[PDB]
Design a protein around this ligand. Structure first.
Ligand SMILES: c1csc(-c2cc(C[NH2+][C@]34C[C@H]5C[C@H](C[C@H](C5)C3)C4)no2)c1
Lengths: 31, 31, 31, 31
């Protein structure tokens, strides 16, 4: 079942997107 | 149709590239 | 054997995750 | 030929790795 798509690929994309939420927030209060 | 390639993979690459544009800009005015 | 999954994909996810560990730590002592 | 592996996937991993080289350098001179 994981042959079609591995959880690492899905998690990787999710992790990167989540990072943007936190990094973007910091950019909002940039100095 | 999405079996060949999922939109998450394409979006992930696009999101990462876009992040660089914003992060790179900040690096330009580094201090 | 690498046809099923290339090491680049696995390494890419690992590299991104590792980056978060270092970047997250910096955010902890943010100023 | 690109069916086996798309250039976007390879480029994505390369782009992320390259980002670390620049981001890591900044961390070296952290303040
Ligand atoms: C489908 C097949 S391979 C495949 C795949 C995903 C990745 C990692 N992508 C990242 C995109 C952004 C966000 C994360 C760090 C890097 C920039 C690389 C995850 N590497 O390969 C997907």
């Amino acid at each position: 079942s994981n042959d079609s798509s591995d959880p690492l690929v899905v998690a990787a994309n999710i992790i990167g997107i989540l990072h943007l939420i936190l990094w973007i927030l910091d950019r909002l209060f940039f100095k």
